Amino acid sequence: HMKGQETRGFQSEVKQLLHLMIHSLYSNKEIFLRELISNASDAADKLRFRALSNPDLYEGDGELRVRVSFDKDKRTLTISDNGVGMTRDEVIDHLGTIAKSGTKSFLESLGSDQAKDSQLIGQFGVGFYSAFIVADKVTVRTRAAGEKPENGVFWESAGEGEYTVADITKEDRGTEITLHLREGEDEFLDDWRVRSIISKYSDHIALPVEIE
Ligand SMILES: Nc1ncnc2c1ncn2[C@@H]1O[C@H](COP(=O)(O)OP(=O)(O)O)[C@@H](O)[C@H]1O
C-alpha cells in the first residue's frame, strides 16, 4: 500500500556515528526513551505554534499526548504522538541527514568513568538515532498537520547504511515510531520498567504520556 518507494543512503558521518553510539551509550541505553518522548513533546509544541494562525490544524483531535504500546509476540515497542507530524521532505531533511552538531565530540568524550558519562548524557541530547542502541529496525509512519491523509510518509531503516522512504495513507495526524528490539532487550517490553524510566524523564518533559 506504498507509493514512491525510494532507498537513500545515510550521510557518511551519520553512518559512522550511528555505529559508534550503539556501543558508547549502551551503559545508558534507556536514554532513547528520553530522546523519543522529548521529540514528541517538541512536535506537540510545534503543532500549537502553527495552530495559532490556523485552528483547523488540531483536526478535532485536540488532546495532545504520546502513547506507548508493546507487542510481546513481535518484540516491538511503539511510541506514537499526535503532534505536528512530518511531510516527506521534512522526513528526508530531519531523519535522513540528522548529523546533529556536537555529536561526534560528545560520543568521543564518553568512556569508562560512568560518573563522567552520566554528567555528559545529562547535558546533551543524542536524538532520534538513539533508538538503534536497543532496536535493529525502526519504522516511522507520520502525517503532518493540515496535510491530506494520502500524503503520509513511511520511513524504515536497519540503522546500517540506508533507509527507505515511501508515501502512505495515514488518517491520524502525528508520528508513530515502531522499534523492533534487539535480542536481549526485553526490558523494553515491560510496561512497569518503561513507565518508570519515562516518569523520571517526564519531570523535565511537558507532554502527557499514556502507557498502554
Ligand atoms: N515525533 C516527531 N514528530 C515530528 N518531528 C520529529 C519527531 N521526531 C523527530 N522529529 C524531527 O526530527 C528532527 C531531529 O530529531 P532529533 O534527532 O531528536 O534532533 P533534535 O530534536 O535536537 O532536533 C527534529 O528536530 C524534528 O524536526
Ligand SMILES: [Mg+2]
Ligand atoms: Mg530530539
